[PDB]
């Protein structure tokens, strides 16, 4: 997979993740969150309907701008999750969860996996598919069902 770790086992900040496959957009009444899946893992999903070993997701938070509508403003947070059956053999679903920054806190270059109770517990109890909240990510179910990442006529 594309995840890179430092010698202490902390996840390094992913590079160029805004070029990954956007799977979801959530609006909080105000923030916008964009969820990405790395491209090789997205290709595997489209083919199999499963998250491969090595899947990386990123959730990027922005503030909201006003249009005279609303649009993406300033970047204010970044979180990530990584699936790895060998590195995370003792986590639910073999997923680890990371904060790179949240509003009012500084960006770190490398993030430590959080304890199971802080993130994985909610994901494993509420996510539709293998601890990823695919119920909110319409690109994923469509891609598996049609083999395509878009509408077809
Ligand atoms: C329930 C109380 C949650 C806890 C605790 C955490 N997360 Fe979560 N996560 C939750 C939801 C409902 C969603 C869908 C998008 C949204 O914000 O509404 C998510 C999504 C993510 C993602 C995107 C990939 C995915 O699994 O869907 C990531 C990378 C993510 N969340 C990270 C994350 C971290 C680092 C957490 C602990 C600090 C954490 N989540 C806790 C619900 C809940």
XYZ file of N, CA, C and O and ligand atoms in Angstrom:
655
model
N 0.808 -1.207 0.000
C 0.000 0.000 0.000
C 0.846 1.264 0.000
O 2.074 1.191 0.066
N 0.188 2.429 -0.056
C 0.891 3.706 -0.180
C 1.283 4.338 1.155
O 1.992 5.356 1.161
N 0.836 3.794 2.276
C 1.205 4.354 3.571
C 2.706 4.255 3.801
O 3.336 3.223 3.525
N 3.271 5.325 4.345
C 4.669 5.376 4.731
C 4.743 5.655 6.231
O 3.963 6.457 6.763
N 5.662 4.970 6.915
C 5.802 5.074 8.363
C 7.231 5.439 8.724
O 8.189 5.017 8.058
N 7.374 6.222 9.793
C 8.716 6.496 10.286
C 9.186 5.344 11.171
O 8.494 4.337 11.348
N 10.406 5.466 11.700
C 10.986 4.361 12.456
C 10.227 4.062 13.738
O 10.340 2.945 14.252
N 9.464 5.018 14.266
C 8.680 4.760 15.462
C 7.327 4.131 15.165
O 6.624 3.736 16.107
N 6.985 3.966 13.891
C 5.722 3.399 13.485
C 4.620 4.404 13.283
O 3.463 4.000 13.104
N 4.945 5.700 13.290
C 3.964 6.746 13.069
C 3.735 6.913 11.578
O 4.665 6.766 10.776
N 2.487 7.205 11.211
C 2.143 7.417 9.811
C 2.656 8.776 9.353
O 2.334 9.807 9.954
N 3.448 8.782 8.287
C 3.842 10.047 7.675
C 2.677 10.670 6.916
O 1.853 9.981 6.311
N 2.625 11.999 6.946
C 1.616 12.746 6.227
C 1.554 12.257 4.777
O 2.585 12.271 4.083
N 0.398 11.799 4.294
C 0.313 11.379 2.894
C 0.631 12.533 1.952
O 0.359 13.707 2.240
N 1.219 12.186 0.807
C 1.597 13.165 -0.204
C 0.594 13.167 -1.350
O 0.192 12.102 -1.844
N 0.190 14.371 -1.761
C -0.641 14.570 -2.950
C -1.973 13.831 -2.854
O -2.516 13.371 -3.870
N -2.522 13.729 -1.640
C -3.761 12.981 -1.439
C -4.965 13.681 -2.057
O -5.991 13.041 -2.269
N -4.869 14.968 -2.392
C -6.002 15.586 -3.067
C -6.149 15.089 -4.499
O -7.183 15.345 -5.122
N -5.153 14.380 -5.020
C -5.239 13.715 -6.311
C -5.752 12.290 -6.196
O -5.797 11.574 -7.202
N -6.129 11.860 -5.002
C -6.721 10.545 -4.805
C -8.178 10.576 -5.282
O -8.646 11.564 -5.851
N -8.908 9.484 -5.084
C -10.293 9.389 -5.537
C -11.188 9.899 -4.423
O -11.228 9.313 -3.332
N -11.912 10.978 -4.699
C -12.877 11.499 -3.739
C -14.084 10.574 -3.710
O -14.670 10.265 -4.756
N -14.456 10.116 -2.516
C -15.590 9.213 -2.383
C -16.753 9.823 -1.626
O -17.891 9.351 -1.794
N -16.530 10.862 -0.833
C -17.611 11.435 -0.059
C -17.368 12.879 0.295
O -16.225 13.339 0.387
N -18.467 13.599 0.486
C -18.467 14.991 0.910
C -19.549 15.157 1.955
O -20.728 14.958 1.648
N -19.161 15.541 3.168
C -20.103 15.756 4.249
C -20.099 17.221 4.647
O -19.060 17.891 4.602
N -21.272 17.715 5.014
C -21.462 19.108 5.393
C -22.019 19.140 6.804
O -23.055 18.524 7.083
N -21.339 19.867 7.687
C -21.722 19.957 9.090
C -22.336 21.318 9.365
O -21.657 22.329 9.153
N -23.588 21.413 9.831
C -24.174 22.733 10.103
C -23.701 23.351 11.418
O -23.402 22.602 12.347
N -19.800 25.963 10.447
C -20.110 25.032 9.366
C -18.807 24.552 8.714
O -17.904 25.341 8.438
N -18.718 23.249 8.477
C -17.534 22.629 7.907
C -17.946 21.771 6.726
O -19.079 21.304 6.641
N -16.995 21.547 5.829
C -17.110 20.552 4.776
C -15.972 19.565 4.973
O -14.827 19.973 5.204
N -16.287 18.278 4.897
C -15.293 17.224 4.970
C -15.273 16.475 3.651
O -16.326 16.083 3.145
N -14.077 16.260 3.112
C -13.888 15.486 1.899
C -13.130 14.215 2.251
O -12.100 14.274 2.933
N -13.637 13.072 1.786
C -13.038 11.765 2.053
C -12.463 11.225 0.748
O -13.149 11.206 -0.281
N -11.198 10.804 0.797
C -10.461 10.244 -0.328
C -10.005 8.822 -0.024
O -9.656 8.500 1.113
N -9.953 7.997 -1.072
C -9.345 6.672 -1.032
C -8.188 6.651 -2.022
O -8.302 7.184 -3.133
N -7.061 6.061 -1.625
C -5.918 6.104 -2.526
C -6.231 5.333 -3.814
O -7.007 4.373 -3.803
N -5.651 5.746 -4.952
C -6.123 5.222 -6.251
C -5.981 3.724 -6.444
O -6.862 3.109 -7.051
N -4.869 3.125 -6.023
C -4.702 1.691 -6.220
C -5.715 0.916 -5.384
O -6.291 -0.082 -5.842
N -6.002 1.404 -4.181
C -7.025 0.761 -3.373
C -8.412 0.989 -3.952
O -9.272 0.101 -3.853
N -8.654 2.155 -4.560
C -9.946 2.366 -5.202
C -10.119 1.428 -6.393
O -11.207 0.888 -6.609
N -9.062 1.235 -7.192
C -9.149 0.301 -8.308
C -9.492 -1.100 -7.820
O -10.270 -1.827 -8.456
N -8.877 -1.514 -6.714
C -9.157 -2.830 -6.151
C -10.609 -2.929 -5.702
O -11.277 -3.942 -5.940
N -11.108 -1.880 -5.043
C -12.514 -1.813 -4.669
C -13.426 -1.980 -5.883
O -14.382 -2.765 -5.856
N -13.185 -1.206 -6.938
C -14.046 -1.272 -8.118
C -14.125 -2.693 -8.661
O -15.169 -3.104 -9.181
N -13.047 -3.464 -8.513
C -12.974 -4.813 -9.058
C -13.583 -5.855 -8.126
O -14.152 -6.841 -8.602
N -13.485 -5.657 -6.808
C -13.762 -6.711 -5.837
C -14.840 -6.360 -4.821
O -15.387 -7.273 -4.191
N -15.146 -5.078 -4.629
C -16.082 -4.677 -3.599
C -15.526 -4.761 -2.195
O -16.296 -4.764 -1.227
N -14.205 -4.832 -2.063
C -13.521 -4.974 -0.789
C -12.395 -3.960 -0.701
O -11.867 -3.507 -1.720
N -12.039 -3.610 0.531
C -10.863 -2.800 0.811
C -9.647 -3.710 0.950
O -9.613 -4.608 1.814
N -8.671 -3.500 0.070
C -7.471 -4.316 0.095
C -6.653 -4.034 1.345
O -6.731 -2.964 1.959
N -5.841 -5.020 1.708
C -4.751 -4.771 2.627
C -3.907 -3.620 2.091
O -3.492 -3.635 0.936
N -3.675 -2.615 2.927
C -2.936 -1.440 2.533
C -3.785 -0.242 2.170
O -3.228 0.805 1.835
N -5.111 -0.359 2.224
C -5.977 0.774 1.907
C -5.648 1.954 2.807
O -5.457 1.785 4.015
N -5.574 3.153 2.212
C -5.475 4.395 2.974
C -6.660 5.283 2.622
O -6.959 5.480 1.436
N -7.330 5.822 3.647
C -8.319 6.878 3.464
C -7.833 8.146 4.148
O -7.082 8.097 5.127
N -8.266 9.283 3.611
C -7.971 10.591 4.180
C -9.266 11.383 4.249
O -10.060 11.379 3.300
N -9.460 12.085 5.358
C -10.606 12.970 5.562
C -10.055 14.368 5.800
O -9.376 14.613 6.799
N -10.333 15.278 4.877
C -9.806 16.639 4.937
C -10.935 17.616 5.227
O -11.975 17.582 4.557
N -10.734 18.470 6.238
C -11.741 19.425 6.680
C -11.408 20.822 6.171
O -10.256 21.256 6.229
N -12.429 21.527 5.702
C -12.303 22.928 5.322
C -13.405 23.721 6.000
O -14.479 23.193 6.310
N -13.137 25.009 6.200
C -14.184 25.956 6.534
C -15.025 26.240 5.293
O -14.725 25.785 4.190
N -16.092 27.003 5.477
C -17.076 27.223 4.426
C -17.042 28.683 4.004
O -17.072 29.584 4.848
N -16.988 28.911 2.698
C -17.126 30.236 2.138
C -18.546 30.492 1.663
O -19.297 29.561 1.383
N -18.907 31.774 1.583
C -20.227 32.205 1.135
C -20.137 32.768 -0.279
O -19.280 33.611 -0.563
N -21.032 32.309 -1.150
C -21.131 32.769 -2.528
C -22.473 33.461 -2.728
O -23.513 32.931 -2.324
N -22.453 34.638 -3.349
C -23.686 35.364 -3.649
C -23.774 35.698 -5.136
O -22.849 36.273 -5.712
N -24.927 30.467 -2.351
C -24.306 29.168 -2.175
C -23.113 29.152 -1.230
O -22.667 30.185 -0.738
N -22.600 27.957 -0.962
C -21.445 27.784 -0.095
C -20.387 26.991 -0.837
O -20.703 26.184 -1.712
N -19.125 27.237 -0.494
C -18.019 26.571 -1.166
C -16.911 26.272 -0.164
O -16.936 26.719 0.985
N -15.916 25.523 -0.634
C -14.783 25.134 0.195
C -13.889 26.332 0.464
O -13.478 27.040 -0.468
N -13.607 26.561 1.746
C -12.820 27.691 2.189
C -11.381 27.333 2.498
O -10.628 26.922 1.613
N -10.981 27.512 3.748
C -9.614 27.269 4.179
C -9.499 25.876 4.775
O -10.431 25.377 5.400
N -8.340 25.255 4.583
C -8.108 23.940 5.162
C -7.878 24.060 6.666
O -7.071 24.882 7.118
N -8.576 23.225 7.446
C -8.541 23.362 8.900
C -8.322 22.038 9.633
O -8.131 22.041 10.847
N -8.311 20.910 8.932
C -8.073 19.644 9.603
C -7.783 18.530 8.625
O -8.122 18.611 7.440
N -7.167 17.467 9.150
C -6.825 16.300 8.342
C -6.716 15.071 9.236
O -5.981 15.079 10.231
N -7.425 14.015 8.857
C -7.409 12.736 9.553
C -7.228 11.632 8.516
O -7.400 11.855 7.316
N -6.892 10.422 8.971
C -6.606 9.334 8.042
C -6.879 8.009 8.725
O -6.887 7.915 9.955
N -7.076 6.978 7.905
C -7.119 5.614 8.397
C -6.355 4.717 7.429
O -6.233 5.021 6.241
N -5.808 3.628 7.963
C -4.958 2.702 7.214
C -5.341 1.276 7.585
O -5.405 0.936 8.771
N -5.555 0.432 6.576
C -5.810 -0.991 6.786
C -4.540 -1.785 6.499
O -3.981 -1.687 5.405
N -4.100 -2.601 7.462
C -2.868 -3.378 7.277
C -2.943 -4.580 8.209
O -2.811 -4.421 9.427
N -3.156 -5.771 7.640
C -3.386 -6.973 8.446
C -2.156 -7.403 9.228
O -2.287 -8.126 10.234
N -0.967 -7.004 8.782
C 0.255 -7.337 9.494
C 0.636 -6.270 10.512
O 0.921 -6.596 11.667
N 0.627 -4.996 10.125
C 1.002 -3.952 11.072
C -0.045 -3.794 12.171
O 0.295 -3.488 13.322
N -1.323 -3.963 11.833
C -2.421 -3.726 12.761
C -3.182 -5.024 13.022
O -4.412 -5.060 13.089
N -2.421 -6.107 13.188
C -2.992 -7.430 13.438
C -3.918 -7.447 14.647
O -4.807 -8.313 14.735
N -3.706 -6.540 15.605
C -4.447 -6.514 16.862
C -5.423 -5.338 16.968
O -5.826 -4.971 18.080
N -5.807 -4.743 15.845
C -6.865 -3.742 15.792
C -8.096 -4.309 15.105
O -7.983 -5.122 14.179
N -9.285 -3.864 15.494
C -10.489 -4.273 14.767
C -10.342 -4.000 13.277
O -9.916 -2.913 12.861
N -10.682 -5.003 12.472
C -10.598 -4.900 11.028
C -9.203 -4.632 10.487
O -9.035 -4.414 9.282
N -8.199 -4.657 11.368
C -6.819 -4.292 11.032
C -6.706 -2.842 10.559
O -5.838 -2.510 9.744
N -7.568 -1.967 11.076
C -7.533 -0.545 10.752
C -6.922 0.254 11.897
O -7.233 0.028 13.074
N -6.080 1.211 11.539
C -5.566 2.202 12.466
C -6.020 3.596 12.040
O -6.218 3.873 10.849
N -6.166 4.480 13.027
C -6.747 5.802 12.837
C -5.795 6.888 13.321
O -5.079 6.701 14.317
N -5.785 8.023 12.598
C -4.780 9.067 12.764
C -5.380 10.461 12.686
O -6.231 10.725 11.837
N -4.872 11.362 13.526
C -5.111 12.802 13.405
C -3.806 13.472 13.007
O -2.810 13.390 13.737
N -3.830 14.208 11.900
C -2.703 15.075 11.571
C -2.911 16.491 12.106
O -1.970 17.095 12.642
N -4.135 17.010 12.036
C -4.503 18.173 12.839
C -6.014 18.341 12.824
O -6.711 17.825 11.954
N -6.506 19.042 13.834
C -7.913 19.407 13.937
C -7.930 20.909 14.149
O -6.882 21.488 14.466
N -9.069 21.575 13.991
C -9.092 23.027 14.165
C -8.501 23.412 15.511
O -8.743 22.755 16.528
N -7.679 24.462 15.503
C -7.054 25.000 16.705
C -5.889 24.148 17.196
O -5.509 24.250 18.367
N -5.306 23.300 16.355
C -4.126 22.540 16.739
C -3.173 22.465 15.555
O -3.600 22.573 14.400
N -1.878 22.271 15.812
C -0.890 22.342 14.731
C -0.743 21.040 13.963
O -0.870 19.942 14.509
N -0.443 21.194 12.673
C -0.152 20.061 11.807
C 1.122 19.355 12.255
O 2.126 20.001 12.569
N 1.072 18.024 12.299
C 2.243 17.201 12.576
C 2.679 16.518 11.288
O 1.868 16.241 10.398
N 3.981 16.244 11.197
C 4.540 15.556 10.037
C 4.264 14.060 10.081
O 4.232 13.399 9.032
N 4.063 13.517 11.277
C 3.817 12.094 11.443
C 2.868 11.924 12.616
O 2.994 12.621 13.626
N 1.923 10.999 12.476
C 0.849 10.828 13.442
C 0.916 9.439 14.057
O 1.174 8.449 13.364
N 0.677 9.369 15.360
C 0.607 8.086 16.050
C -0.803 7.517 15.950
O -1.793 8.244 16.082
N -0.890 6.210 15.725
C -2.192 5.560 15.694
C -2.880 5.762 17.033
O -2.258 5.675 18.095
N -4.155 6.064 16.984
C -4.873 6.350 18.200
C -5.351 5.056 18.847
O -5.520 4.035 18.170
N -5.573 5.061 20.158
C -6.097 3.853 20.800
C -7.432 3.443 20.202
O -8.231 4.282 19.772
N -7.655 2.123 20.187
C -8.871 1.548 19.625
C -10.113 2.303 20.083
O -11.031 2.550 19.294
N -10.165 2.660 21.364
C -11.375 3.245 21.929
C -11.718 4.603 21.327
O -12.887 5.011 21.366
N -10.737 5.318 20.778
C -10.971 6.704 20.379
C -11.584 6.840 18.994
O -12.220 7.864 18.715
N -11.424 5.841 18.129
C -11.853 5.975 16.742
C -12.444 4.674 16.229
O -13.592 4.632 15.762
N -11.652 3.606 16.317
C -12.069 2.313 15.775
C -13.377 1.826 16.391
O -14.194 1.198 15.702
N -13.600 2.104 17.683
C -14.807 1.619 18.345
C -16.065 2.136 17.656
O -17.003 1.369 17.395
N -16.100 3.431 17.324
C -17.280 3.950 16.641
C -17.355 3.433 15.214
O -18.430 3.064 14.732
N -16.227 3.383 14.521
C -16.265 2.923 13.140
C -16.738 1.473 13.062
O -17.580 1.135 12.224
N -16.237 0.598 13.944
C -16.621 -0.805 13.836
C -18.073 -1.031 14.227
O -18.676 -2.021 13.795
N -18.657 -0.132 15.006
C -20.040 -0.299 15.402
C -21.038 0.365 14.471
O -22.217 0.011 14.521
N -20.610 1.276 13.593
C -21.556 2.058 12.801
C -21.276 2.120 11.306
O -22.199 2.436 10.551
N -20.073 1.820 10.847
C -19.785 1.884 9.419
C -20.429 0.720 8.680
O -20.416 -0.415 9.162
N -20.920 0.986 7.464
C -21.616 -0.058 6.717
C -20.672 -1.153 6.241
O -21.059 -2.329 6.190
N -19.438 -0.799 5.876
C -18.559 -1.734 5.169
C -17.152 -1.672 5.755
O -16.394 -0.744 5.444
N -16.781 -2.696 6.537
C -15.390 -2.894 6.939
C -14.793 -1.595 7.494
O -13.703 -1.160 7.114
N -15.540 -0.974 8.409
C -15.117 0.175 9.212
C -14.919 1.459 8.408
O -14.338 2.409 8.914
N -15.452 1.508 7.188
C -15.505 2.692 6.342
C -16.977 3.018 6.152
O -17.779 2.119 5.893
N -17.331 4.300 6.273
C -18.727 4.726 6.262
C -19.252 4.874 4.826
O -19.722 5.931 4.390
N -19.181 3.758 4.092
C -19.552 3.746 2.683
C -21.012 4.094 2.460
O -21.373 4.452 1.332
N -21.855 4.033 3.499
C -23.250 4.435 3.321
C -23.375 5.881 2.872
O -24.406 6.253 2.297
N -22.351 6.696 3.112
C -22.354 8.108 2.739
C -21.521 8.405 1.503
O -21.417 9.580 1.110
N -20.940 7.385 0.864
C -19.961 7.567 -0.210
C -20.507 6.969 -1.501
O -20.159 5.834 -1.862
N -21.328 7.716 -2.250
C -22.063 7.087 -3.357
C -21.182 6.592 -4.482
O -21.598 5.692 -5.216
N -19.966 7.105 -4.631
C -19.123 6.617 -5.725
C -18.803 5.135 -5.541
O -18.677 4.395 -6.522
N -18.676 4.673 -4.292
C -18.195 3.314 -4.038
C -19.232 2.250 -4.407
O -18.925 1.315 -5.154
N -20.471 2.363 -3.919
C -21.446 1.334 -4.268
C -21.742 1.357 -5.758
O -21.908 0.293 -6.366
N -21.787 2.555 -6.372
C -22.046 2.632 -7.804
C -20.940 1.945 -8.586
O -21.210 1.212 -9.546
N -19.684 2.151 -8.180
C -18.569 1.635 -8.966
C -18.565 0.119 -8.971
O -18.328 -0.523 -10.007
N -18.807 -0.468 -7.816
C -18.853 -1.916 -7.752
C -20.002 -2.466 -8.592
O -19.844 -3.479 -9.285
N -21.163 -1.803 -8.558
C -22.345 -2.345 -9.222
C -22.248 -2.243 -10.738
O -22.797 -3.092 -11.449
N -21.558 -1.228 -11.249
C -21.506 -0.969 -12.679
C -20.127 -1.188 -13.288
O -20.015 -1.246 -14.523
N -19.080 -1.285 -12.472
C -17.732 -1.320 -12.991
C -17.224 0.006 -13.511
O -16.153 0.039 -14.122
N -17.953 1.102 -13.283
C -17.590 2.412 -13.800
C -17.721 3.467 -12.714
O -18.527 3.345 -11.788
N -16.920 4.512 -12.860
C -16.871 5.622 -11.920
C -17.515 6.853 -12.561
O -16.861 7.867 -12.831
N -18.811 6.747 -12.815
C -19.565 7.805 -13.458
C -20.886 7.256 -13.940
O -21.113 6.043 -13.955
N -21.785 8.171 -14.298
C -23.031 7.744 -14.928
C -22.723 7.200 -16.318
O -21.775 7.633 -16.981
N -23.533 6.249 -16.778
C -23.472 5.804 -18.168
C -24.845 5.940 -18.805
O -25.865 5.689 -18.156
N -24.870 6.350 -20.075
C -26.129 6.486 -20.815
C -26.556 5.149 -21.402
O -25.885 4.134 -21.209
C -18.472 8.050 15.864
C -18.784 8.721 17.212
C -17.053 8.313 15.337
C -15.872 8.337 15.972
C -15.575 8.276 17.469
C -14.849 8.605 14.990
N -15.441 8.632 13.756
Fe -14.440 8.769 11.990
N -16.215 8.749 10.989
C -17.463 8.736 11.597
C -18.464 9.020 10.596
C -19.983 9.140 10.771
C -17.729 9.219 9.301
C -18.369 9.528 7.940
C -17.980 10.916 7.439
C -18.460 11.949 8.422
O -17.599 12.666 8.981
O -19.691 12.059 8.646
C -16.352 9.010 9.621
C -15.355 9.055 8.694
C -14.017 8.997 8.955
C -12.983 8.850 7.959
C -13.230 8.654 6.450
C -13.136 7.157 6.118
C -14.249 6.336 6.760
O -13.967 5.411 7.575
O -15.458 6.576 6.456
C -11.814 8.887 8.606
C -10.395 8.781 8.028
C -12.087 9.051 10.018
N -13.453 9.103 10.205
C -11.153 9.142 11.017
C -11.445 9.122 12.365
C -10.488 9.294 13.430
C -8.986 9.565 13.232
C -11.135 9.193 14.597
C -10.540 9.278 16.020
C -9.802 10.562 16.401
C -12.522 8.927 14.314
N -12.695 8.907 12.940
C -13.511 8.752 15.249
C -17.722 8.476 12.928
C -16.787 8.463 13.930
